Design a binder for these strands. Structure first.
Ligand SMILES: [Mg+2]
Ligand SMILES: [Mg+2]
Ligand SMILES: [Mg+2]
Ligand SMILES: [Mg+2]
Ligand SMILES: [Mg+2]
Ligand SMILES: [Mg+2]
Ligand SMILES: [Mg+2]
Ligand SMILES: [Mg+2]
Lengths: 78, 55, 140, 68, 42, 97, 166, 105
RNA sequence: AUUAAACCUUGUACCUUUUGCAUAAUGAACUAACUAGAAAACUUCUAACUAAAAGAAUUACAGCUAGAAACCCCGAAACCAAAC
RNA sequence: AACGAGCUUGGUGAUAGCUGGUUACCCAAAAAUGAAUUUAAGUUCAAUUUUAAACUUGCUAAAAAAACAAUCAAAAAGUAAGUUUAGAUUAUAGCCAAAAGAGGACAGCUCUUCUGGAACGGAAAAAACCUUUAAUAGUGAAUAAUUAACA
C-alpha cells in the first residue's frame, strides 16, 4: 500500500522531537564521580518513613462513649 | 484489670518503655474492657514497674 | 412457603415503567421489556458523549456556510481570528451569524485582513513593521 | 456589541469599558441522568442515577462607558 | 465513676437498645448476588 | 404479579400476658440455687435433643438412639434412608477435602 | 367473570337547569356465553357501527351468518327497553354508538388424531355488547380536500424553528 | 429515558429577576413523633435549626405538627402551586438541614 | 434528539459456550406461581477468666472458654430382591 | 402396541471425571508454565495469585572480573516496594501479530524462546495491527493514529 503524505509528515515531526532529545541528553551537568553521595541523606530519610508505616500497624482504641452512645437511639421528648 | 483513668496509665507506660526501645511504643486502649495493649513482650519490665507503684 | 416475596409487583413495575413508549410485546412483557430497556439505557449513556461531538460538527457546517458568504473558507476564518488574539469558540460564532449578521461581517473582514497581512509578511521578507492588526499583545 | 458598532477584546475587554451585572435567580439540581457502561452482562440493575447541582442566572444589565 | 455517670444521663436500657459488641459478628455470604452467584465460587 | 385488594386484619399482640411477662425466670436456677439444677433441665422438647445440639446427621442418629425401638415402621425406614443419604453427603461430597 | 356493562344502565344523573341542552339517552345491552367465535362475531359487530337501528336491522336480516340473528335479537331488546324503561320517545330516533364482541368462558375437549395422537380442542363462546344513543347517526367522515391537504403542509413549515441554537 | 420522558425549556415563574427577587418556596410542613427512633434526627432539627431557618427565610410559613407517626414527612409548597413531599425517615439533623436548604432555593 | 408520532444521525438480540471472536452452535411463544451452597479439624474476628480455663472425664512452656464465620440442583444405560 | 431378554413395587435421593442449570446492589485485587497419575473431558503438588500479620531493605539500574548476550552484580541514582510467618482456592486446552532459532547448518509447515495486544478512534473488510493512564456532568478547547498515491 502507498505510504500517505500526511503520515510521512507526522513521523518526520516525531523524528525531529526524538533527535533533539539526543542533544539535551548529551550535556551531563555532573560527572559520575560528582554524583556519588550527593543525595544519600534524602534517600535514607525516605526509607525510614516507609519502615515506620509498616511497623505501626496495630488495632484501634475503643471507647465506652461510643458503645453507650447507641442508647441515644431511644431518645425521646418528655 | 485496670481501673480508674486508663489514659494516665498509657502515658506513664509510654514514658517508661520509650527509653529502652528508643521509640514510643504502639499501644491500644480498650476503654470498655479496661485493658491496655502494648506491642512486644515486656512482661518482666512491667511487672516490676507495677510492683514499685504498689498496685 | 415459609417466605415468599410479597413486593415483586413493584420490581416488575420499575422495569415496565421504562418501556411504555415502546412498540410490540416489549412494552408489556417483563422477559422482553427488560432486555429492551437495558439497550435503551446503554444507548442513552453512549449518546451523552455524542451530542457534544455532533453539536460541534453542526457548528462547523454553519460557520463554513457563514464565512463562505463573505468569501472565506472555514480554515482561513478560524485561524486568522485566533492569530488576531481574539478567542471565540465555535458555539457563539454560529450564534453571531444567525442572530447578529452585521457583527459577523466585521469578524469576516477582520479575519480577511489578517490573512492578507500574513500573506504580505511572507511575501515581503526582511525587517518591516507588521500590519496594524498583526501586532500581538503580550501578557506577563 | 450594539446595532451599529462592536468592541472586541484581545482577548478580554478592560473592566471600565464593560460591566455585566447578573442575579442568582434560583439554585437547583439536574433531572436524574442514567449512566450504564457498555459491558458484557449489562443487567438492568448495574445503572447509576447521576444528578448534578445547578444554578440559574439572569443577565440584568449590560452597561458601557465612553472610555475608549 | 465518670463512665458510670454517663449512663445516668442516657435513656433507659431496654430490649430494643441491645447491640452486639463491635465486629463481634460477621456477614454471612449467600449465593444470591453476582459476585457470589452464578458459578457460585466453584 | 397480584396483590391483595383489601388490608388484612390488624394483628394485636398482648405483651403482658402471663407467658411473656414471666419469660426467662429461673434461667439462673443453678448459680443462684447452689447448682441444684442445671438450666438445661428446664428445656421442654424432644427427649433426644433436650440440652443438646448437633447437625442433621448427628440429629438423625440421636433420634434413633433414644426412640429407635419405639418408632413406627415407615418412620424408621425413612430415618434409616435419611441417615444413609446424609452419610454419603457429609463424608464423600462437598467443596472442601 | 365481570359484569359491568349491566350496571352502567342504572346510572342516575342530576336534574338539568331550565336551559340546558337535552341530554341524549344511552342504553347498555348485551348477551353472554354465545356459542360463537369472538373473531367471527366482530365482523358482524363492526358492520353495524355508526348506523341507525332501522338501518342496522335491515342489513342484518339478509346476512347468512349465524351471528346476524343473534345480534338482531339484542338490537330489538335494546330497542324495546329504551322506549319503556329509559324514556326514549321515538323508536326511530336511535343509532348504534358502540358494538363489539368479547371472549367468554370456554370448554376444553379432545380432538382425536391419526397415530394414537390428539390435540386440545376448545369449544368457543363469546359476549356481544351494544350501546344505543338517542339521535340520528352522526354525519360520516368527510375526506380532506386538496386545499386542506396543502394547508397542513404550509402549517408544518411555518412551525419550523432554528434547531440547536439560541 | 430522554425519549422516554418529558422535557421543557428554561423558564422562570414571573420573571423573577427582572424586578424584585421573590422567594418561590411558600410553605414547609413537618410532622414528628414524640417517641419514635426514626424521627429522632428530625426532633433535633426542630430543637435548634428550625428557629434559625424561620428567621433567615421570612417568606416561608413553617408548620410543625408533632403527631403519633411512623415516618416524618416534609411537604414543600411553591408559589406556582407545585407540591413536593420528601420522606425524612431516620435522617440525621445534618441531612435534614441540607435537604431543607435545597427546597428553599 | 426535535416545533413535530414517523423521515435525519448513531447502533452486528440475550444467555450458555467455545481462546479472552461470532453473521456461529445450544436453550427460551408469552404470563402467573414454584424451582439449586448444608457441616467448624485448622485459621480469622469478638468477648469471660487467666498459670490457669471449663457446670465431672478436656486442654495448657499464655492459655482456655463461649460467640459469630463453610462446602448446591436436575438427568442415564444398568444391577439385585420380591410380587404380577 | 419398541424384549440381545418382560413388567410393577422396593433397594433408590442408585451412580455419573459427562451435558444442562445455579435468583439483590456496591467497592476493590486478579492466571491455559513444571511433575506424577488406567493419566491426557480428571485430580494432586510445585509455580503463580490472594487476605492478614511480622520487620527491612527491594525493583530498574548494576563499573571493573570473572564462568562465557546473556548467568552473575558495587558504590551510586530514579524510585516504593521486597523477605518471612498463618490461612485459601481456582487454574493446569489459549487466540492473533512481530522477532529468533531448530527440525529436512533451508524458506515454508510443526514445534521452541522472547515481545505486544483485547476502543467509543482509525486501517474496503476490522476481538489480535496503529492512536489511547481509570470514570463523572457541561450546547467548552487543544490534540493523536488516519482520512491513499501522483511517483
Ligand atoms: Mg451458608
Ligand atoms: Mg386408536
Ligand atoms: Mg390450538
Ligand atoms: Mg426454542
Ligand atoms: Mg445427581
Ligand atoms: Mg508458560
Ligand atoms: Mg485416563
Ligand atoms: Mg478426566
Amino acid at each position: 500500500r502507498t505510504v500517505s503524505f500526511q503520515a510521512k509528515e507526522s513521523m518526520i515531526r516525531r523524528l525531529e522531537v526524538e533527535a533533539e532529545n539526543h542533544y539535551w541528553l548529551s550535556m551531563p551537568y555532573m560527572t559520575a564521580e560528582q554524583e556519588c553521595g550527593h543525595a544519600a541523606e534524602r534517600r535514607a530519610q525516605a526509607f525510614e518513613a516507609i519502615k515506620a508505616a509498616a511497623t505501626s500497624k496495630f488495632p484501634k482504641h475503643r471507647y465506652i462513649a461510643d458503645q453507650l452512645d447507641h442508647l441515644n437511639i431511644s431518645k425521646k421528648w418528655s | 484489670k485496670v481501673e480508674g483513668d486508663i489514659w494516665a496509665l498509657q502515658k506513664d507506660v509510654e514514658e517508661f518503655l520509650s527509653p529502652l526501645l528508643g521509640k514510643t511504643p504502639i499501644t491500644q486502649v480498650n476503654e470498655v474492657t479496661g485493658t491496655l495493649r502494648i506491642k512486644g513482650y515486656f512482661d518482666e519490665q512491667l511487672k516490676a514497674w507495677l510492683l514499685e507503684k504498689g498496685f | 412457603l415459609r417466605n415468599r416475596l410479597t413486593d415483586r409487583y413493584w420490581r416488575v413495575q420499575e422495569v415496565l415503567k421504562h418501556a411504555q413508549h415502546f412498540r410490540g410485546r416489549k412494552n408489556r412483557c417483563y422477559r422482553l421489556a427488560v432486555r429492551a430497556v437495558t439497550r435503551a439505557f446503554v444507548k442513552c449513556t453512549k449518546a451523552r458523549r455524542l451530542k457534544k461531538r455532533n453539536l460541534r460538527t453542526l457548528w462547523i457546517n454553519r460557520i463554513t456556510a457563514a464565512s463562505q458568504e463573505h468569501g472565506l473558507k472555514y480554515p482561513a476564518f478560524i485561524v486568522n481570528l485566533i492569530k488576531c488574539q481574539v478567542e471565540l469558540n465555535r458555539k457563539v460564532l454560529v450564534d453571531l451569524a444567525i442572530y447578529e449578521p452585521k457583527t459577523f461581517k466585521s469578524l469576516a473582514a477582520l479575519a480577511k485582513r489578517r490573512q492578507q497581512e500574513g500573506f504580505a509578511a511572507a511575501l515581503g521578507d526582511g525587517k518591516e513593521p507588521e500590519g496594524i492588526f498583526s501586532r500581538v499583545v503580550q501578557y506577563h | 456589541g450594539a446595532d451599529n458598532f462592536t468592541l472586541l477584546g484581545k482577548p478580554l475587554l478592560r473592566k471600565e469599558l464593560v460591566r455585566v451585572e447578573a442575579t442568582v435567580i434560583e439554585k437547583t439540581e439536574s433531572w436524574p441522568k442514567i449512566n450504564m457502561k457498555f459491558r458484557k452482562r449489562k443487567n438492568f440493575r448495574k445503572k447509576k442515577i447521576i444528578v448534578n447541582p445547578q444554578t440559574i442566572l439572569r443577565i440584568n444589565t449590560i452597561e458601557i462607558a465612553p472610555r475608549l | 465513676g465518670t463512665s458510670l455517670d454517663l449512663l445516668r444521663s442516657l435513656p433507659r436500657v431496654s430490649l430494643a437498645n441491645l447491640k452486639p459488641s463491635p465486629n463481634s459478628r460477621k456477614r454471612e455470604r449467600r449465593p444470591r448476588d453476582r459476585r457470589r452467584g452464578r458459578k457460585c465460587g466453584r | 404479579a397480584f396483590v391483595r385488594l383489601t388490608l388484612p386484619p390488624p394483628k394485636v399482640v398482648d405483651r403482658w400476658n402471663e407467658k411473656r411477662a414471666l419469660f426467662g425466670v429461673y434461667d439462673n436456677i443453678g448459680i443462684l440455687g447452689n447448682f441444684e439444677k442445671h438450666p438445661k433441665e428446664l428445656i421442654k422438647g424432644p427427649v433426644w435433643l433436650r440440652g443438646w445440639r448437633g447437625n442433621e446427621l448427628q440429629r438423625c442418629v440421636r433420634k434413633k438412639k433414644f426412640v429407635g425401638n419405639r418408632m413406627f415402621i415407615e418412620d424408621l425406614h425413612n430415618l434409616n434412608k435419611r441417615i444413609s443419604y446424609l452419610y454419603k453427603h457429609f463424608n464423600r461430597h462437598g467443596k472442601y477435602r | 367473570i365481570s359484569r359491568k356493562w349491566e350496571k352502567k344502565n342504572k346510572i342516575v344523573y342530576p336534574p338539568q337547569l331550565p336551559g340546558e341542552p337535552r341530554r341524549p339517552a344511552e342504553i347498555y345491552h348485551c348477551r353472554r356465553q354465545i356459542k360463537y367465535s369472538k373473531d367471527k362475531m366482530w365482523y358482524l359487530a363492526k358492520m353495524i357501527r355508526g348506523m341507525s337501528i332501522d338501518q342496522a336491522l335491515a342489513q342484518l336480516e339478509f346476512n347468512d351468518k349465524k351471528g346476524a340473528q343473534i345480534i338482531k335479537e339484542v338490537l330489538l331488546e335494546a330497542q324495546d327497553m329504551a322506549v319503556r324503561d329509559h324514556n326514549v320517545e321515538f323508536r326511530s330516533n336511535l343509532h348504534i354508538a358502540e358494538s363489539t364482541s368479547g371472549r367468554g368462558q370456554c370448554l376444553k375437549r379432545i380432538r382425536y388424531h391419526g397415530r394414537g395422537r390428539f390435540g386440545i380442542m376448545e369449544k368457543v363462546y363469546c359476549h356481544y355488547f351494544v350501546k344505543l344513543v338517542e339521535g340520528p347517526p352522526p354525519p360520516p367522515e368527510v375526506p380532506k380536500t386538496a386545499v386542506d391537504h396543502a394547508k397542513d403542509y404550509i402549517q408544518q413549515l411555518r412551525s419550523r424553528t432554528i434547531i440547536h441554537t439560541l | 429515558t430522554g425519549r422516554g420522558t418529558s422535557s421543557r425549556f428554561l423558564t422562570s415563574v414571573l420573571h423573577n429577576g427582572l424586578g424584585r427577587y421573590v422567594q418561590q418556596l411558600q410553605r414547609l410542613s413537618l410532622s414528628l413523633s414524640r417517641d419514635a427512633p426514626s424521627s429522632r434526627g428530625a426532633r433535633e432539627f426542630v430543637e435548634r435549626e428550625v428557629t434559625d431557618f424561620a428567621r433567615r427565610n421570612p417568606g416561608v410559613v413553617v408548620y410543625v405538627n408533632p403527631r403519633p407517626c411512623a415516618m416524618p414527612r416534609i411537604v414543600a409548597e411553591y408559589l406556582n402551586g407545585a407540591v413536593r413531599e420528601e420522606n425524612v425517615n431516620s435522617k440525621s439533623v445534618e441531612e435534614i438541614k441540607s435537604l431543607v436548604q435545597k427546597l428553599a432555593d
